[PDB]
């Protein structure tokens, strides 16, 4: 079945941040308005037997001192008195300031994404679900001891760690479709050949987070050399050109790596209508949405997959895209046609889809060849280092 993470408390916590507000509610309510909920298997977020069990789970990646600081930041934001100078210095030491501030539910909010993504990994491992979606997860920037880019705990790293460690040779392919470089996940697995990371994103001078591009092109280290793939793209790319840029890379990675699991971060900030206004992707499903092209391709591999959210700052448009991704996932996994009306159905949040109330977003739609040659050579180097056997000509021809 296709699983999806949701629950009453989970929705309350996912809607508690100052940056993302009620985005998760709009997404889940639009999926519910389109009558998709009965086609999906609810995956409950993971809850623990004790504070010690929760710390053991989160500290599989994060440091205890960072988790302690994040918990303290929540406690302090639950009192009226301002922080002491010492507490401000402590929070600054973990980058819990500026664009990653505290708020009354910061720890419960961050931990909820981890609870959802670990449960989603568990549902794949026990084979209850072929695919699991978590629109409350996908926080790719958080590091071992540092908050970054509105990400406090890295639910993706923790979910991948659960997938990789599920066997007593498991390989995971991580694909990051967000407008931003998936730096936190790439860094977490920089030295591991068992987790291959691939991020497609915009990169340009001063654009966050500044990595995933020429620096030379770094691609992992130690036994993880050649295991971190990146495709930086110039501003203004449309659905067709982004699809042609990533299509052969995705197919080649699947052929060579033969992953046991795929984890996809589907941040919606590439949409033409996102306030970043950098890429020109759509949610159109007749050009065809780059996101839908990539998801349909990944699902065609028939490998257990986790689909996560991420960025997306135009809330109704992110809900429009993720509702289409959810319906496509049902169609591809089950072979059950999911007919979605081009008109938004009446529901609680209907007014947020005005003035047109349509499902399609309101939009009228050599560098890459060099990247393809570079990525092909890196994949050959990865395969050689890891003693994997593949047909070079079968892979060369995809490009
Ligand atoms: C000292 N000070 C006041 C600041 C310093 C740095 C920033 C910043 O880089 N902001 C950029 C953060 C953007 C994160 C992008 C998140 C995303 O969608 N990832 O996928 C801001 C303020
Ligand atoms: C683990 N994972 C991601 C999957 C597992 C099983 C299937 C499958 O067999 N699906 C059967 C139906 C295929 C739908 C496509 C048919 C079509 O497009 N007809 O026009 C798919 C994915
Ligand atoms: K990305
Ligand atoms: K790696
Ligand atoms: Zn982003």
TrEMBL record:
<keyword id="KW-0378">Hydrolase</keyword>
<dbReference type="InterPro" id="IPR023801">
    <property type="entry name" value="His_deacetylse_dom"/>
</dbReference>
<dbReference type="InterPro" id="IPR000286">
    <property type="entry name" value="HDACs"/>
</dbReference>
<feature type="domain" description="Histone deacetylase">
    <location>
        <begin position="22"/>
        <end position="327"/>
    </location>
</feature>
<keyword id="KW-0804">Transcription</keyword>
<dbReference type="GO" id="GO:0046872">
    <property type="term" value="F:metal ion binding"/>
</dbReference>
<keyword id="KW-0539">Nucleus</keyword>
<keyword id="KW-0678">Repressor</keyword>
<comment type="similarity">
    <text>Belongs to the histone deacetylase family. HD type 1 subfamily.</text>
</comment>
<keyword id="KW-0479">Metal-binding</keyword>
<keyword id="KW-0805">Transcription regulation</keyword>
<dbReference type="GO" id="GO:0031507">
    <property type="term" value="P:heterochromatin formation"/>
</dbReference>
<protein>
    <recommendedName>
        <fullName>histone deacetylase</fullName>
        <ecNumber>3.5.1.98</ecNumber>
    </recommendedName>
</protein>
<dbReference type="Pfam" id="PF00850">
    <property type="entry name" value="Hist_deacetyl"/>
</dbReference>
<dbReference type="InterPro" id="IPR037138">
    <property type="entry name" value="His_deacetylse_dom_sf"/>
</dbReference>
<dbReference type="GO" id="GO:0005634">
    <property type="term" value="C:nucleus"/>
</dbReference>
<dbReference type="GO" id="GO:0141221">
    <property type="term" value="F:histone deacetylase activity, hydrolytic mechanism"/>
</dbReference>
<keyword id="KW-0156">Chromatin regulator</keyword>
<feature type="binding site">
    <location>
        <position position="180"/>
    </location>
    <ligand>
        <name>Zn(2+)</name>
    </ligand>
</feature>
<feature type="binding site">
    <location>
        <position position="269"/>
    </location>
    <ligand>
        <name>Zn(2+)</name>
    </ligand>
</feature>
<dbReference type="InterPro" id="IPR023696">
    <property type="entry name" value="Ureohydrolase_dom_sf"/>
</dbReference>
<feature type="binding site">
    <location>
        <position position="178"/>
    </location>
    <ligand>
        <name>Zn(2+)</name>
    </ligand>
</feature>
<keyword id="KW-0862">Zinc</keyword>
